[PDB]
Design a protein around this ligand. Structure first.
Ligand SMILES: Cc1cccc(-c2c[nH]nn2)c1
Ligand SMILES: [Co+2]
Ligand SMILES: [Co+2]
Length: 355
């Protein structure tokens, strides 16, 4: 059919043949084609997830306004996301919680139950959310502002991210991507409220390889010089994301934790403790190795689960991912796209008309 104003028509119902739009195809900076065609169903899954992502974010940009609580923004975004991705257990759904980190906080912040935070006119909000089909995760994010005073900061980071995307490729050394991203990032200077800053990358934050049902596969893409010389390989999927800040350029754990994720390497652990055993079963059935938040547990009817959750974390079965913020008073911005290192080319599968 044809998608409605407020999204409601699943992406699979808009492409009856099962073939989904490709993202932007670029050349790296027959045989290799047969190989590409061999994993076509995989690429296709990534695309379906991206189309869901592109329509969801365009919807968000249409109504996100200061005055709304952070919980309303996330629940409205997630509702639409579940609809378009046509959530089906672990076969299709949300890959991780809706990040909406504010101001000096760069990532991993999503409201828990009872959070009364309200989006403000001067807020710099990072919307980071993902969708997946068969575990093929699409990690893509953008920054939201209402005050044009951040325009230059946003452009700086957007330009740095697209620079990282362009420098990415097969045999490209990872430290060369980080060196490039920083050089562009620091080529920007901004003025916010009578003070000037040279945008700086958040050195302890970075891009990452993506694996099936594993948001952070194992390889990291730095956004500053001095990284590993490890190379990007053929067929890998990468999340290219950069963060710009007017602070120290370093983030630290802060505020209450809302993000949690099962340790991908841990195996079966028999638990006799009633509540802890139940919570783990719920995580395995609903999220598997995909990240989740406390709101997604409340949603499923769970209550009195914090202690059980803490046990799982203490056991090393679940890992907490608290908000990562720069110093108080600073501003941070982010832009992220997922790219596929296909044999015949480089596809920025999450690319949209928006960014
Ligand atoms: C490990 C972990 C937990 C929660 C969210 C992310 C994330 C979001 N965008 N990129 N990475 C990663
Ligand atoms: Co992300
Ligand atoms: Co990411």
């Amino acid at each position: 059919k044809v998608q409605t104003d407020p999204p409601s028509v699943p992406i699979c119902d808009l492409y009856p043949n099962g073939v989904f739009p490709k993202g932007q195809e670029c050349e790296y900076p027959e045989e290799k084609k047969a190989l590409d065609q061999a994993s076509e169903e995989i690429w296709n899954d990534f695309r379906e997830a991206a189309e869901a992502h592109r329509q969801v974010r365009k919807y968000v940009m249409s109504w996100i306004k200061p005055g709304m609580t952070m919980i309303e923004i996330c629940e409205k975004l997630e509702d639409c996301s579940r609809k378009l991705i046509k959530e089906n257990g672990l076969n299709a759904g949300l890959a991780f919680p809706t990040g909406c980190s504010l101001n000096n906080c760069a990532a991993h912040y999503t409201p828990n139950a009872g959070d009364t935070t309200v989006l403000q006119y001067d807020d710099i909000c990072k919307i980071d959310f993902g969708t997946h089909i068969s575990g093929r995760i699409i990690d893509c994010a953008f920054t939201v502002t209402f005050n044009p005073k951040y325009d230059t900061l946003l452009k700086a980071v957007k330009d740095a991210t697209n620079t990282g995307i362009k420098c990415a490729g097969i045999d490209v050394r990872l430290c060369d991507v980080g060196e490039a991203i920083q050089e562009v990032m620091e080529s920007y200077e901004v003025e916010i409220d009578g003070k000037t800053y040279q945008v700086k990358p958040i050195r302890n934050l970075n891009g990452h390889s993506i694996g099936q049902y594993r948001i952070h596969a194992g390889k990291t893409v730095p956004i500053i010089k001095g990284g590993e010389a490890t190379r990007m390989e053929e067929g890998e999927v990468y999340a290219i994301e950069t963060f710009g800040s007017t602070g120290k350029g370093v983030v630290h754990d802060d505020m209450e934790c809302s993000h949690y994720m099962k340790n991908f390497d841990v195996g079966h652990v028999p638990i006799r403790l009633p509540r802890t055993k139940h919570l783990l079963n719920v995580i395995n059935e609903n999220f598997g190795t995909l990240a989740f938040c406390r709101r997604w547990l409340d949603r499923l009817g769970e209550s009195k689960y914090l202690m059980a959750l803490k046990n799982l974390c203490d056991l090393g079965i679940v890992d907490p991912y608290p908000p990562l913020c720069d110093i108080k008073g600073s501003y941070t911005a982010q832009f992220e796209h997922t790219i596929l290192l296909r044999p015949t080319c480089k596809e920025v599968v999450s690319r949209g008309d928006d960014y």
